[PDB]
Amino acid sequence: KVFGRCELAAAMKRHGLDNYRGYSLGNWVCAAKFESNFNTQATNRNTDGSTDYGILQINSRWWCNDGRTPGSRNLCNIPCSALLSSDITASVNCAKKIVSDGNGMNAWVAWRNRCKGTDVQAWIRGCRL
Ligand SMILES: [Cl-]
Ligand SMILES: [Cl-]
Ligand SMILES: [Cl-]
Ligand code: NA
């Protein structure tokens, strides 16, 4: 599924992401825009052989099992395919574990490079929330 901007903001809010670990909703919407262009089916392979999955591009070396990333840790205890669902619940629950891991949202390279320090409130402007 490809979400609309406000539709995703509303879904993320309902799943408890607004101000989760101090990150306002706009941060999460901005990260999703630049990681996946709001597409739950997005995948991208990395040079180390791991693959990033779903709306928040969660990586198979640490967080999910895809059966093809040797020595990987599956910290979210889920098959990576679960992260591609139209239902964002699995992605949200795993993202909460990631953002709690010590480096906050710096775990998402697109967030660090394209959202951090910008007016992220613009991402939720106009939405009925
Ligand atoms: Cl915000
Ligand atoms: Cl894909
Ligand atoms: Cl980047
Ligand atoms: Na893994």
Ligand SMILES: [Xe]
């Ligand atoms: Xe891929």
Ligand SMILES: [Xe]
């Ligand atoms: Xe998400």
